[PDB]
Enzyme design. Structure first.
Site, PDB file in Angstrom:
ATOM      1  N   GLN A  20       0.796  -1.196   0.000  1.00 60.86           N
ATOM      2  CA  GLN A  20       0.000   0.000   0.000  1.00 60.86           C
ATOM      3  C   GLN A  20       0.854   1.283   0.000  1.00 60.86           C
ATOM      4  O   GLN A  20       0.361   2.335  -0.378  1.00 60.86           O
ATOM      5  CB  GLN A  20      -0.994   0.027   1.177  1.00 60.86           C
ATOM      6  CG  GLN A  20      -0.406   0.150   2.565  1.00 60.86           C
ATOM      7  CD  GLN A  20      -1.499   0.154   3.589  1.00 60.86           C
ATOM      8  OE1 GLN A  20      -2.148  -0.854   3.829  1.00 60.86           O
ATOM      9  NE2 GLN A  20      -1.765   1.304   4.132  1.00 60.86           N
ATOM     10  N   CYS A  26      -5.444   0.657   3.201  1.00 65.15           N
ATOM     11  CA  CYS A  26      -5.695  -0.704   3.751  1.00 65.15           C
ATOM     12  C   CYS A  26      -7.134  -1.179   3.570  1.00 65.15           C
ATOM     13  O   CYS A  26      -7.381  -2.326   3.282  1.00 65.15           O
ATOM     14  CB  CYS A  26      -5.242  -0.813   5.251  1.00 65.15           C
ATOM     15  SG  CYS A  26      -6.283   0.225   6.352  1.00 65.15           S
ATOM     16  N   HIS A 166      -7.109  -0.668  11.384  1.00 67.59           N
ATOM     17  CA  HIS A 166      -6.713  -1.080  10.040  1.00 67.59           C
ATOM     18  C   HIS A 166      -7.599  -2.190   9.507  1.00 67.59           C
ATOM     19  O   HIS A 166      -7.985  -3.098  10.253  1.00 67.59           O
ATOM     20  CB  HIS A 166      -5.264  -1.572   9.998  1.00 67.59           C
ATOM     21  CG  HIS A 166      -4.257  -0.476  10.144  1.00 67.59           C
ATOM     22  ND1 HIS A 166      -3.984   0.127  11.356  1.00 67.59           N
ATOM     23  CD2 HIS A 166      -3.466   0.124   9.231  1.00 67.59           C
ATOM     24  CE1 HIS A 166      -3.071   1.063  11.174  1.00 67.59           C
ATOM     25  NE2 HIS A 166      -2.729   1.069   9.898  1.00 67.59           N
ATOM     26  N   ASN A 186      -2.216  -9.103   4.817  1.00 67.02           N
ATOM     27  CA  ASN A 186      -2.082  -7.625   4.916  1.00 67.02           C
ATOM     28  C   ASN A 186      -1.760  -7.001   3.597  1.00 67.02           C
ATOM     29  O   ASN A 186      -1.700  -7.720   2.586  1.00 67.02           O
ATOM     30  CB  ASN A 186      -1.108  -7.233   6.027  1.00 67.02           C
ATOM     31  CG  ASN A 186      -1.510  -5.951   6.744  1.00 67.02           C
ATOM     32  OD1 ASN A 186      -2.159  -5.097   6.180  1.00 67.02           O
ATOM     33  ND2 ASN A 186      -1.090  -5.805   7.991  1.00 67.02           N
TER      34      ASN A 186
END
Ligand code: 8PW
Length: 219
Positions: A20, A26, A166, A186
């Site tokens: 990212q 996110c 997040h 992630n």
């Protein structure tokens, strides 16, 4: 009965880990991740979808998303629904910056009809959804430096709270050396965690708020 161990990566339903950068996107990676899983299960094709399309085109009060300033996975799905589609990453690539929306319906790569929210804090409901539905978008408290020190095992820092900050994607669960975990994808690239993934404590009183705000889309 539910399986003891699930890993959507094994069924080809999880795209490559993305990076990212310095854009607070996110939420966009979490949403497209959940939608990618559903697309694969329906069409049989694994396609990376456009986090940039969400970042650029849902940055307005209608949705409450803020581009690189943060956002909500449910609102991302709602945008896709309202818009009648989302592009693939190939045709609408990630720039890690807020840009003017340039969505083109001729490059539509997926659609969304509705999304489902799970009960607040119910890890049993999350286990069922991950088992039977596919990858699930979640919020977690990922504000503790220990989150970035993790390399292996099961992340279970007592300083974690239920105040989430997040968006990430749950792609599986199981038990590692006696410790129940959620398998979380992630968007910090392959150098984060274990090849971009972290195993986070499961069944430990909704640790890091992982089961607080769960959702997934329906094509
Ligand atoms: C990712 N780069 C960033 N984080 C980010 O965009 C996060 C993602 C969601 S959240 O998961 O933190 C969240 C926060 C609060 C929620 O509801 C509270 C309520 F309504 F009950 F009071 C829900 C969520 C969830 F549903 F999980 F998304 C939002 N968010 C934010 O940064 C916002 C826009 C500030 C809140 C940028 C770090």
């Amino acid at each position: 009965t539910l399986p003891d161990t699930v890993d959507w990566r094994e069924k080809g339903c999880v795209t490559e880990v993305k990076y990212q950068g310095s854009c607070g996107a996110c939420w966009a990676f979490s949403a497209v991740g959940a939608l990618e899983g559903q697309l694969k299960l329906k069409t049989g094709k694994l396609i990376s979808l456009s986090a940039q399309n969400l970042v650029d085109c849902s940055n307005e009060e209608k949705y409450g998303n803020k581009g690189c300033g943060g956002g909500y996975m449910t609102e991302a799905f709602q945008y896709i629904i309202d818009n009648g589609g989302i592009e693939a990453d190939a045709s609408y690539p990630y720039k890690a910056m807020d840009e003017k929306c340039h969505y083109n319906s001729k490059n539509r790569a997926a659609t969304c009809s509705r999304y489902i929210q799970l009960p607040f804090g119910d890890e049993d409901a999350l286990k069922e959804a991950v088992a039977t539905k596919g990858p699930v978008s979640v919020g977690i408290d990922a504000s503790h430096s220990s989150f970035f020190f993790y390399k292996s095992g099961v992340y279970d820092d007592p300083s974690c709270t239920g105040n989430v900050n997040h968006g990430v994607l749950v792609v599986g669960y199981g038990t590692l050396d006696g410790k129940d975990y959620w398998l979380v994808k992630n968007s910090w690239g392959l150098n984060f965690g274990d090849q971009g993934y972290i195993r986070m404590a499961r069944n430990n009183k909704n640790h890091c708020g992982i089961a607080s705000y769960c959702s997934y889309p329906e094509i």
